[PDB]
Amino acid sequence: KKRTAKKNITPYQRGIIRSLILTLDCSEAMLEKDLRPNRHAMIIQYAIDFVHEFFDQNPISQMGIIIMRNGLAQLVSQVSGNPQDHIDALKSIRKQEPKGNPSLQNALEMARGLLLPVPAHCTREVLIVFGSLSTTDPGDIHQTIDSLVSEKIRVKVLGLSAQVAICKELCKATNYGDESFYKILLDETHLKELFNEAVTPLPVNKINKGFTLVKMGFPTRIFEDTPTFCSCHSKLVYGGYFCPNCHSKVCSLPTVCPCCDLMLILSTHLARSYHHLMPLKTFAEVPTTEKFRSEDCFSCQSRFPXXXXXXXXXXXXXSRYRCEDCKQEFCVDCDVFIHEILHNCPGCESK
């Protein structure tokens, strides 16, 4: 009894530096009484959740946020590399209330205008969030879809309890034909999982486009405390970072340089990407009576696995989900937490 991705294709190249733009709909549709508080406020909630999720897991990417109201679409965040701007924007939104209906075309076009200064290595994806049953366009739709996917921008949309095959067709266009991006839901657990997978870099079978280098340098922490002075907010900065060549002071941020305009991280972010470079073979649940390994966990120490024949119960799940390339165990919580947080296969890292 398993519902598992049979082939976890990940050993290649996914979209890393993603210029992500969630779009929001704040219309009378988001009011309606089908979700527990509402669609609307719950969406604000899970959107904040995604802000943290994304900027954690994609801590080298950028973001701007746009909402839609009253047959009009409204940006709420300039392209920002500080999460809290998005966070407090979302706060300022939640208290504002939805009205009217989404002018989908205007949102698409605003986004189109936004992601233009993004270079090649910076990749372009928008993120619809939809709960309405209709749009309001002022401009020819498939016209703008043509422009969009002609400028190489796949989009992931998350509609609510319906289907709108224009969304599927537009996505299939944006996603080079192949479609998986019109994920809509039927439950709130379902909703958050949708988010969590929206976080990860997204490959399908990549169009072999330009692989361009990216150049940068690294700043250095400061020593003097009283010497408070800033050039990125022009405020007091009691100690921080120092552009490798431009040698300006920068308050703590992974941002691009504000003087000679070059990117500045340390190394950690590369390491997160590597954790998204070679994920591991899935821990296979060892065959029930043919496993007969040592009776505990390896990664943790979990002596439970069976009761040795209780006719039904023990003969159920001889749960020893152990790795593939290392074949070294790890209990169910160990499998979940390894594959979840620290993929870090020690048994496979061990040798």
């Binding site: 361009t212 340098g217 060549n245 190394s267 390491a271 990407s273 990664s299 943790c300 947080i341 890292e349």
Partner: protein
């Protein structure tokens, strides 16, 4: 606020062989075991029955040292039993040492032990929802050479970094070795908030133990005691090997390179780069 002490003390009779080899053969790491045993008793006293654990790395593996893996199937009366259990464990592991053990000298299983420690810690912390431990770890290394900078294990070392950071876990370090600053572990403790202990051998470490590695469990309002600066001019160009400062970073490969690039197919990933883009790079 009960806390977990996860001490990671490597025991390589290679690293221990260096341990004796450096300086005189006047005192083995037995002293280190003793100071650690006393310190563990101390930390156990510190809180009202706050759990702890220790693991160590063989030349060819690792084993839970405190936990007493399922094998059946004085002072407080309990410091005795914990330490004595531990002593039986470590000596019995010293049976697990021979020529075949004298063979498995390819890698350094520090990182895997570190991860597994994190895993068991999390196994408690997620298992212990009630009585949430505010836990942290310690690293110990009888430091040596013959492999100037083992780079293979560096990546999952970073992975453990983030594992602890998200897991909100202090991680302090005590390397006992030659005059070499383990920049891996250096920046590890640096970001992940530990304290750097690059020491000499024969000093009775007890003082450094009781002083520098009692901060975190609940406190952290005290001036940390790091070593000198922790520069983030990180690992070198994969080709050149000389520590690089201004990035020339390849691609989705993220091979970090010097002014070298072969014009194509970076010397870590078989992936070309536009030679005109190479002209754009060498436009400097």
């Amino acid at each position: 606020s009960p806390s977990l002490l996860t001490v990671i003390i490597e025991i390589a009779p290679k690293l221990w062989t260096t341990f004796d080899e450096e300086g005189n053969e006047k005192g083995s790491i037995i002293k280190v075991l003793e100071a650690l045993i006393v310190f563990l008793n101390a930390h156990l006293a510190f809180n009202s029955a706050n759990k702890v654990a220790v693991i160590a790395a063989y030349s060819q593996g690792i084993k839970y040292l405190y936990p007493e893996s399922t094998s059946a199937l004085x002072x407080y009366r309990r410091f005795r039993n914990v330490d004595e259990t531990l002593v039986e464990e470590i000596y019995k592991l010293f049976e697990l040492e021979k020529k075949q053990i004298e063979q498995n000298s390819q890698r350094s299983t520090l990182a895997g032990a570190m991860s597994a420690g994190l895993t068991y810690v999390n196994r408690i912390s997620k298992e212990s929802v009630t009585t949430s431990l505010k836990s942290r770890l310690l690293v110990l290394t009888c430091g040596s050479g013959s492999s100037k900078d083992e780079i293979f294990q560096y990546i999952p070392i970073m992975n453990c970094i983030f594992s602890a950071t998200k897991m909100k876990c202090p991680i302090d370090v005590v390397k006992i070795g030659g005059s070499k600053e383990s920049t891996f572990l250096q920046q590890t403790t640096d970001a992940t908030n530990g304290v750097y202990l690059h020491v000499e051998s024969t000093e009775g470490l007890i003082q450094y133990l009781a002083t520098a590695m009692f901060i975190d469990p609940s406190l952290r309002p005290i001036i940390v005691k790091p070593n000198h600066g922790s520069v983030d001019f990180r690992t070198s160009c994969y080709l050149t090997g000389r520590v690089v400062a201004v990035g020339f970073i390849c691609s989705v490969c993220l091979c970090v390179l010097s002014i070298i690039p072969p014009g194509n197919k970076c010397p870590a990933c078989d992936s070309q780069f536009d030679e005109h883009v190479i002209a754009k790079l060498k436009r400097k």
